[PDB]
Design a binder for this molecule. Structure first.
Ligand code: CDL
Ligand code: PC1
Ligand code: 3PE
Ligand code: NDP
Ligand code: SF4
Ligand code: SF4
Ligand code: SF4
Ligand code: ZN
Lengths: 143, 43, 114, 143, 206, 38, 96, 380, 290, 178, 94
């Protein structure tokens, strides 16, 4: 909307991709990946996993595991916030709400003793999801 | 191949002024009629 | 710090304007229960005037007092000229609602009223 | 040109099922016009037409005396008109069902229902979403 | 271009020249003259120049700003003088329009101009009723749009949309009583503003 | 023509807001956190 | 249109005008319900080349007010615009 | 002084202080139709707020949509295309006709002559039919929007409008026969609510209340906004400033509206109807359902609408009742910060007291009718 | 407890009060206030009616949207009372005539119908039943109305031991058959106000120390019939009615009274002025004790 | 360009002829008999009235009346719970609540409209990217309680099933204009 | 299909039923519970699987407009079908 145009000159056929299954938390619609590699880098660097990657080349290229592996880490769930698009989503939050409906309060975790700064997004008096909140001296965008 | 409801070569002419007609007759004649009726009645 | 005033220089003149306004109200009160057939007694009305005056006693600013005087004069106009009605005047007593109990327990027991 | 008017009138009078039909019409629909019968619907209603009358009276309807168990000899509603005839009667079209029939699709109501604002089969609202917060139930045996 | 709006500079020139004119005639009571992209002239002034400036613009031969198109107020609660006041004025001899603005707050009133333009007799009452701003030397100043016992100034930014009270008829007392507000569907607050800047020309510095 | 009133400022009696909603409350001043989605 | 010449003449004499040509009830002179289907045009920005938004945005061609005489940062006497030119009586019908 | 409260029991409340049969003081009362439009608009996008203007001054509704449209377009720095401009002018004139029918006939009704009401509300029905054929609603057609117009005209509308314009003149004449030269109408109106030009100006009047006192001010011949600069029409001015002069002015305005409609029809151009800037006006549905960018723009426009660079405007429209204005303040957001509506009925009511000087109780009901007082534009 | 009952809210029209009340006798004169007091705090109210739908329209606006449920019934028709008592926690009975018709004797009204109501309540499984009677309820009574009342109280307690009987005295308000009956034209009275009675009943609807008890709702003062009627005439046909009139009001001893529900008496000397100004075209009465 | 109303081009003549004409106008009540004639002419015309329940007023395929939730030919619903209708509805009249269905689809559990809040503006069917919610043609759905106008998914789906034989045709008519 | 609960209430296409102990069943007394008897979750299952000779297939629902946005589905996974997120239809690769 801001930096792009307002119409398409692409009168050709699109492509489609086989959707993976990589856990009970992360839903994968991989025909939306814009091949940015944020997931791969997050995994390799922070989560120390080295199980995501790019198999193929050209437009026929796509992201994920060459096999049916599952991505279940203590940090798996930040790929959701990091994926700029809805290629990786959260199965729990699936279809329950839309952002412009949510009221956002700022709170903290109690699950552990770290005190990760968090956002609770409600809708008509119900808790819909939980998000991180930047505190660069505790958690720095992760939860 | 296109069609978006334009007008044809032209629409007819329109009347936007008054046409209030000049009716009745003259006051002299009206008074004469009334007075003739009146005199007939009196007689 | 320094300011620009409104209709007064000090709380003394402000209070004497207030006392003039109270004269006016106190005097007019019964004519209202007469004109519009209110059930309440003139004693109740006058106690209510006193309550609504003392509700703004802590005030110190001559300007915040002059504005309250202005608004009370507006109300007195609306009242002596019959523009208000029985409804608007009885909207002061709250005859159709219970108040939030001023008791920690009476609050806790029913709701989250803090 | 007055005797022709009287002739048109006498034919408008006798153009029904004699005195009985004439009274029926004149007392339900205060009108004794004669028109062409374009069709009749499942519920017994009739729809007449005459293109020489002016816009708004060039089409009309004679409702049924019974509709889904209701004496409609006197009580009558524009809600009785099913959709296919509603669209031709409110002049959204120049073509009725007989020539331009609708699209035969299941899940479309075969039997039309009229307004039920107070009948016992009326509409009562409610919430369609299940319970959100499930409570705790303890066992039925102590200690 | 067919999708963009034309742009005439003659009006910008005329109105900048008239801004200089007005400002050098009234170096006092004047500050922040500005003519905008869409060719409209605003003059900001001090609350002590209302009648001087309005009279000058109405009577002066070069100005003849006779018609008071509108009087308005605007609430910006992040500035000490939060109530902007706006007079939109029209001149027929020149086919021209102008905006004269001043500022105010609570407890800091403005001077009335019914002496200059009598249309204001009701606009100023409306401002007092809606934004809570007093005017000096106004014959009658009283609730005009709100109810008779209404306590508040609802066109502010801190007054809630739905209000504080609510009305209904009660058979016991046989009247239309007021009560606190209890809604059966709380108004929903949609957070729409986008995170991505849309106009760099207005980018504030950090 | 100027006066000096150095006492703290208050307009509570002019706002028209009631006691329940002017004393039983707690306000929060902050900068809304960035949505980690964007 | 369903009236006798006698009534038509009566009403026309009582009114002074002719009504059977400027009636207010519509008799088949009106457009036909169930019109054919259209095919609408497309705007001028439906090109496939030379159609960059940088050239035709508009709402980013706006600029903040051009400030003058900010208090912190022998000319002639002018008017906000040249005086308005007075109008001309019509030619078709200037009176009534 | 024989005081009384009149009007209610349809939202008007006059407080009248008489002296015998004369009228000494007229105090109107306001706020019986105050809903809070100007505040609600602050919680709604630049499109969620348009209907409010259809609801203000509810006899025209489209000369109301038009002002908001022009203001938002002035901010966005865009302009709609010729076909949209012509449709918009045509329908603005139709709304003018509706409003003037309304005014004249309710005037004659509150005075006692009631047959014009029924003779003309049939034409009003026939024009509501156009409203509906183009928008789907008889009165509140949210049809004119920033960027042009929602939909194009169906294929059988201009012919109908021509058939209607053919005979509206004879209808106006039918009414004029009864009313204009009737001694009773002239006695009820002549020399009533007189007002001089300078006092009108200083009171803030606009429209017929100006040009019935000899002033020459029409915001279509001056400060034009649409293609009105491409069409011809006369402006009727008065000589005495009385109800009779204003009646004649409104009639001749209803006539100039036909003069303008003939031209609009004959000169209707082809082309698009809304600016092809899909960041302001949504795309078509086929493009929405086949193209990615168009669908994104649809989504954003109907959830978080178009953003408007900050600024302020006062766009005035020559509405049937006078100068309709909108002081619109914008922050760089999808929603406005302030929208103030300038309505003429406001100042007209304000001046009612002076216009009712040296007059009875039965002349005030005509003084009011001569202003076309609708309380939606007033109480807002 | 069922989550549909948890009293969420702030005590207002659009709130929840956990009170599901089936009320018999709402078309009358005291139900017109009982229903208001029930609904203006957010309670569900089932109202059975036998009247025509016009005489029950003054009650549609006293409760929030969806809280009022008007259905039809017939005292002689059983299975028209299950419908109404089912889906409830509280039942309130306010029936009663000041005279006898053909189909309905005092026996029926005050004994046989309340008994079936309480039977159906117990069958359903509701948890509170409130019955209203007269203060002078006693088998030794010139009037057979009071006889039937004192019989029906026992006939109720025999099926609903935990019931709640409430004996007020001559009630005075607008559209009342006491002050208007007097002003139409040896015995001490202590009248009471519909507002007080309704407040008491609606409080008992929740208060936990009210079951299996009785209450004598009487005003703060007492008056001699003559002084009271003269007060009426200064501010300005049924045998059983006149009998109930010519009986003095008991001073019930140590019976749980009005101030035990929380209510406070509202003296008649304050509401007579609003009740009586309708019958137009002064000093108070000396309160006494025998 | 301007004109004059109630202004004469020049003074008149006081001639006996014109004076007598005006005196006739006054005495004989001339300008009023013409109004009587207009009323008589209108008496001798055809009225624009129509038998309502039998003769109905004309409408267009764009009329915005009662609401409906549509389906696909398969019978599957169309609403995918995208909430654009709820986000554009000026009066905040649409309440929606969705979930993943057991067959793994984006479908609603709750879709409520308040007809005492709808201003009947059509923005919802302008926004729906699937043509699922439509402001249909019906206008005769008055009631006797305020609780029969609070609609829901069930009522709206029933209205769709009811009126689809007409909604589909009107949409086929008009969809080329939008 | 609507199948009734112990209390005698019909269940909806989203499993809503007032618990037998619920007081909210009153509103239905002397009245009905409006319920739709045509369950999309079953009507779509009644439809058959389409077959195509291409590993990628575009769906729109029918008419270009009057349908839904053109979406492209992959058919490389012969284990299951390729479903459309809009219309529910499902395709296979043959
Ligand atoms: C329930 C009854 C209770 C008992 C009460 C006692 C009964 C009283 C009798 C009244 C009967 C009225 C009922 C009329 C409906 C009868 C059914 C019928 O005829 O169908 C209409 C049918 C007309 O159908 P249409 O297609 O609508 O055409 C109408 C004409 O185009 C349009 O017609 P038009 O306007 O052009 O005029 C045609 C002609 C019609 O004839 C009359 O109106 C004569 C009226 C009596 C004169 C006094 O009138 C004339 O213009 C010529 C005569 C001029 C008379 C002068 C009047 C002063 C000027 O036939 C008639 O019009 C005949 C009715 C004539 C009335 C007879 C009563 C005398
Ligand atoms: C249901 C069926 C009902 C049937 C009802 C039938 C009623 C029939 C009654 C006659 C109809 C007349 C209607 C008016 C026709 C229109 C006339 C017209 O347009 O020209 C006017 C014209 C229009 O004039 P003008 O204004 O246009 O221009 C002329 C102006 N001057 C004269 C000043 C130069 O005016 C006249 O000529 C008036 C002529 C009549 C004047 C005499 C009337 C007053 C004296 C009364 C005498 C006593 C009563 C006599 C009657 C006795 C019986 C009641
Ligand atoms: C032998 C020779 C000499 C013999 C002597 C006699 C010679 C003839 C004398 C002439 C007589 C003239 C007729 C008498 C009546 C005249 C009354 C009159 O003229 O009234 C004047 C009045 C208007 O006066 P004004 O306001 O000053 O005029 C406007 C100024 N620009 O006007 C009015 O206000 C009237 C108001 C009328 C409103 C109702 C009109 C209804 C008309 C219905 C038709 C009635 C027809 C008659 C019915 C007959 C009944 C059977
Ligand atoms: N006011 C007093 O003097 C005192 C009164 N009470 C009690 O107050 C209660 C109500 O007083 P009040 O409000 O004056 O009663 P009302 O007469 O005002 O109305 C009572 C209700 O009883 C219903 N009712 C009466 N007989 C029958 C019947 N045979 N079949 C069906 N319904 C019937 C009526 O329903 P509809 O109107 O639909 O017929 C009416 O609405 C009475 O039960 C009485 O015992 C107790 C002590 C003192
Ligand atoms: S973060 Fe998302 S868009 Fe980026 S490579 Fe991973 S799946 Fe693709
Ligand atoms: S038509 Fe009604 S429901 Fe649809 S968007 Fe407009 S107000 Fe909302
Ligand atoms: S816009 Fe259409 S698909 Fe989206 S939530 Fe609304 S009705 Fe459903
Ligand atoms: Zn599909």
């Amino acid at each position: 909307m801001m930096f792009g145009s307002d119409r398409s000159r692409f009168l050709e056929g699109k492509r489609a991709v086989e959707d993976k299954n990589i856990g009970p938390l992360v839903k994968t619609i991989m025909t939306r990946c814009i091949q940015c590699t944020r997931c791969i880098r997050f995994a390799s660097e922070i989560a120390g996993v080295d199980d995501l990657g790019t198999t193929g080349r050209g437009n026929d290229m796509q992201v994920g595991t060459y096999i049916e592996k599952m991505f279940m880490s203590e940090l798996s769930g930040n790929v959701i916030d990091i994926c700029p698009v809805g290629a990786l989503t959260s199965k729990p939050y699936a279809f329950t709400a839309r952002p412009w409906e949510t009221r956002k309060t700022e709170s903290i975790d109690v699950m552990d003793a770290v005190g990760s700064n968090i956002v609770v997004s409600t809708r008509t008096g119900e808790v819909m999801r939980i998000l991180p909140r930047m505190h660069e001296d505790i958690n720095e965008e992760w939860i | 191949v296109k069609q978006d409801m334009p007008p044809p070569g032209g629409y007819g002419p329109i009347d936007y002024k008054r046409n209030l007609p000049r009716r009745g007759l003259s006051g002299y004649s009206m008074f004469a009629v009334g007075i003739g009726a009146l005199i007939f009645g009196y007689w | 710090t320094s300011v620009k005033p409104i209709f007064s220089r000090d709380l003394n003149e402000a209070k004497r304007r207030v006392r003039e306004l109270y004269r006016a109200w106190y005097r007019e009160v019964p004519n209202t229960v007469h004109l519009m057939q209110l059930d309440i007694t003139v004693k109740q009305g006058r106690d209510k005037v006193r309550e609504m005056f003392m509700k703004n006693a802590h005030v110190t600013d001559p300007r915040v007092v002059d504005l309250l005087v202005i608004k009370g004069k507006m109300e007195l106009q609306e009242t002596i000229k019959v523009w208000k009605q029985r409804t608007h005047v009885m909207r002061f007593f709250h005859e159709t609602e219970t108040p939030r109990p001023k008791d920690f327990l009476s609050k806790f027991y029913m709701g989250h009223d803090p | 040109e007055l005797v022709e008017v009287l002739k048109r009138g006498v034919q408008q009078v006798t153009g029904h099922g004699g005195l009985r039909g004439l009274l029926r019409v004149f007392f339900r629909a205060n009108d004794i016009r004669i028109g062409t019968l374009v069709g009749e619907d499942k519920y017994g209603n009739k729809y007449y037409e005459d293109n020489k009358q002016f816009f708004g009276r060039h089409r009309w309807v004679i409702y049924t005396t019974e509709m889904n168990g209701k004496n409609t000899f006197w009580d009558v509603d524009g809600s009785m008109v099913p959709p296919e005839w509603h669209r031709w009667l409110h002049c959204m079209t120049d073509d009725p069902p007989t020539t331009n029939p609708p699209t035969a699709r299941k899940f479309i109501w075969t039997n039309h229902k009229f307004n039920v604002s107070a009948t016992p089969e009326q509409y009562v609202p409610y919430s369609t979403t299940r319970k959100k917060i499930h409570e705790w139930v303890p066992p039925s045996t102590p200690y | 271009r067919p999708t963009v709006r034309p742009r005439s500079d003659v009006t910008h020139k005329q109105l900048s020249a008239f801004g200089e004119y007005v400002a050098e005639i009234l170096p006092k009571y004047v500050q922040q003259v500005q003519v905008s992209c869409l060719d409209e002239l605003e003059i900001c002034i001090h609350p002590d120049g209302v009648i001087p400036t309005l009279t000058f613009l109405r009577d002066h031969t070069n100005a003849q700003f006779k018609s008071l198109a509108d009087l308005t107020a605007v609430d910006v609660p992040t500035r000490q003088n939060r109530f902007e006041i706006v007079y939109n004025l029209l001149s027929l001899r020149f086919n021209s329009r102008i905006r004269v603005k001043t500022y105010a707050d609570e407890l800091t009133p403005i001077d009335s101009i019914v002496s200059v333009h009598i249309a204001a007799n009701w606009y100023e009452r409306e401002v007092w009723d809606m934004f809570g701003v007093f005017f000096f030397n106004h014959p009658d100043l009283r609730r005009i749009l709100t109810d008779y016992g209404f306590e508040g100034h609802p066109f502010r930014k801190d007054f809630p949309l739905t209000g504080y009270v609510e009305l209904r008829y009660d058979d016991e007392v046989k009247r239309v009583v007021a009560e606190p507000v209890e809604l059966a569907q709380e108004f929903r607050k949609f957070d729409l503003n986008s995170p991505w800047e849309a106009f760099p020309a207005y980018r504030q510095p950090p | 023509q100027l006066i000096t009133v150095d006492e703290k400022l208050d307009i509570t009696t002019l706002t028209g807001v009631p006691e329940e909603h002017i004393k039983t409350r707690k306000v929060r001043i902050f900068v809304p956190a960035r949505n980690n989605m964007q | 249109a369903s009236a006798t010449r006698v009534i038509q003449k009566l009403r026309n004499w009582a009114s002074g005008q002719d009504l059977q040509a400027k009636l207010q009830l519509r008799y088949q002179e009106i457009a036909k319900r169930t019109q054919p289907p259209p095919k609408l045009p497309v705007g001028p920005s439906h090109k496939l080349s030379n159609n960059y938004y940088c050239t035709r945005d508009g709402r980013r061609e706006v600029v903040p007010p051009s400030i003058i005489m900010s208090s912190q940062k022998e000319k002639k006497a002018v008017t906000p615009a040249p005086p308005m030119k007075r109008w001309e009586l019509s030619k078709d019908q200037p009176y009534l | 002084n024989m005081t009384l409260n009149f009007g209610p029991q349809g939202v008007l409340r006059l407080v009248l202080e008489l002296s015998g049969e004369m009228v000494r003081k007229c105090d109107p009362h306001i706020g019986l139709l105050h809903r809070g439009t100007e505040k609600l608009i602050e919680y709604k996008t630049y499109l969620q707020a348009l209907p409010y203007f259809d609801r203000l001054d509810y006899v025209s509704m489209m000369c109301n949509e038009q002002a908001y449209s022009i203001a938002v377009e002035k901010l966005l720095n865009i302009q709609p295309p010729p076909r949209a401009q012509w449709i918009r002018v045509l329908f603005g004139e139709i709304t003018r006709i509706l409003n003037h029918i309304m005014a004249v006939t309710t005037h004659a009704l509150d005075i006692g002559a009631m047959t014009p009401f029924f003779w003309m509300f049939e034409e009003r029905e026939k024009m509501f039919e156009f409203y509906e054929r183009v928008s789907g609603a008889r009165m509140h057609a949210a049809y004119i929007r920033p960027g042009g117009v929602h939909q194009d005209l169906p294929l059988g509308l201009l012919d109908d409008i021509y058939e209607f314009s053919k005979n509206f003149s004879l209808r106006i004449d039918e009414v004029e026969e009864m009313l204009t030269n009737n001694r009773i109408w002239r006695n009820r109106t002549v020399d009533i609510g007189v007002v001089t030009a300078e006092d009108a100006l200083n009171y803030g009047f606009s429209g017929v209340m100006l040009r019935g006192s000899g002033i020459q001010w029409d915001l279509r011949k001056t400060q034009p906004y649409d293609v009105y600069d491409q069409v011809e029409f006369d402006v009727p001015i008065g000589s005495r400033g009385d109800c009779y002069d204003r009646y004649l002015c409104r009639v001749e305005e209803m006539r100039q509206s036909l003069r303008i409609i003939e031209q609009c029809l004959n000169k209707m151009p082809p082309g698009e109807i809304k600016v092809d800037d899909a960041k302001v006006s949504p795309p078509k549905r086929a493009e929405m359902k086949t193209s990615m960018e168009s669908l994104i723009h649809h989504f954003k426009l109907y959830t978080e609408g178009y953003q408007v660079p900050p600024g302020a405007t006062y766009t005035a429209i020559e509405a049937p009742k006078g100068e309709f204005g909108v002081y619109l303040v914008s922050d760089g957001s999808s929603r406005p910060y302030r929208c103030k509506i300038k309505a003429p009925g406001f100042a007209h009511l304000a001046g009612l007291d002076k216009m009712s000087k040296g007059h009875m109780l039965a002349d005030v009901v005509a003084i009011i009718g001569t202003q076309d007082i609708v309380f939606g534009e007033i109480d807002r | 407890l069922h989550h549909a009952v948890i009293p969420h809210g702030k005590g207002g029209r659009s709130s929840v009060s956990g009170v599901v009340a089936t009320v018999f006798g709402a078309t009358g004169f005291l139900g017109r206030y009982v229903v208001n007091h029930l609904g203006r705090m957010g309670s569900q109210v089932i109202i059975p009616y036998r009247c025509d739908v016009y005489d029950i329209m003054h009650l549609r606006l006293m409760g929030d949207l969806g809280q009022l449920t008007f259905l039809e019934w017939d005292a002689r028709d059983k299975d028209s009372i299950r419908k109404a008592v089912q889906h409830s926690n509280v039942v309130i009975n306010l029936i009663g005539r000041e005279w006898e018709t053909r189909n309905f004797d005092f026996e029926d009204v005050f004994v046989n119908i309340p008994r079936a109501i309480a039977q159906a309540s117990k069958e359903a499984g509701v948890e509170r039943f409130i019955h209203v009677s007269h203060l002078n309820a006693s088998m030794k009574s010139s009037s057979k109305s009071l006889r039937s009342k004192a019989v029906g109280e026992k006939e109720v307690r025999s099926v609903f031991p935990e019931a709640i009987i409430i004996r007020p005295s001559d009630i005075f308000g607008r559209e009342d058959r006491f002050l208007n009956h007097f002003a139409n034209y040896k015995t001490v009275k202590q009248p009471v106000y519909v507002a007080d009675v309704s407040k008491g009943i609606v409080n008992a609807t929740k208060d936990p120390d009210a079951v299996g008890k009785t209450f004598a709702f009487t005003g703060p003062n007492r008056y001699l019939l003559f002084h009271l009627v003269k007060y009426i005439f200064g501010m300005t046909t049924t045998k059983d009615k006149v009998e109930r009139i010519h009986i003095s009001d008991v001073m019930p001893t140590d019976l749980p009274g009005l101030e035990d529900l929380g209510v406070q008496p509202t003296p008649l000397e304050l509401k007579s002025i609003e009740v009586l100004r309708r019958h137009r075209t002064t000093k108070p009465a000396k309160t006494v004790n025998y | 360009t301007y004109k004059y109303v109630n202004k004469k081009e020049q003074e008149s003549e006081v001639d006996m002829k014109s004076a007598t004409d005006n005196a006739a106008r006054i005495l004989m009540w001339t300008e009023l008999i013409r109004g009587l004639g207009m009323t008589l002419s209108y008496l001798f015309r055809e009225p624009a009235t129509i038998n309502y329940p039998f003769e109905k007023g004309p409408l267009s395929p764009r009329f915005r009346g009662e609401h409906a939730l549509r389906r696909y030919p398969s019978g599957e619903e169309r609403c995918i719970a995208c909430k654009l209708c709820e986000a554009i509805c000026p009066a905040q009249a649409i309440t929606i609540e969705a979930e993943p269905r057991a067959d793994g689809s984006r479908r609603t559990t709750r879709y409520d409209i308040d007809m005492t809040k709808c201003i009947y503006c059509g923005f919802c069917q302008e926004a729906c990217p699937v043509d699922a919610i439509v402001e249909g043609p019906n206008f005769e759905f008055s009631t006797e309680t305020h609780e029969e106008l609070l609609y829901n998914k069930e009522k709206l789906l029933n209205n769709g099933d009811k009126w689809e034989a007409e909604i589909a045709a009107n949409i086929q008519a008009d969809y080329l204009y939008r | 299909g609507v199948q009734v609960s112990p209390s005698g209430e019909k269940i909806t296409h989203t499993g809503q039923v007032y618990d037998e102990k619920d007081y909210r069943r009153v509103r239905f007394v002397d009245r009905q519970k409006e319920v739709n008897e045509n369950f999309a979750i079953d009507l779509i299952a009644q439809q058959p699987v389409n077959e195509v000779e291409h590993r990628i297939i575009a769906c729109d629902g029918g008419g270009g407009a009057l349908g839904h946005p053109k979406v492209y589905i992959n058919l490389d996974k012969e284990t299951k079908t390729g479903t459309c997120g809009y219309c529910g239809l499902q395709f296979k690769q043959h």
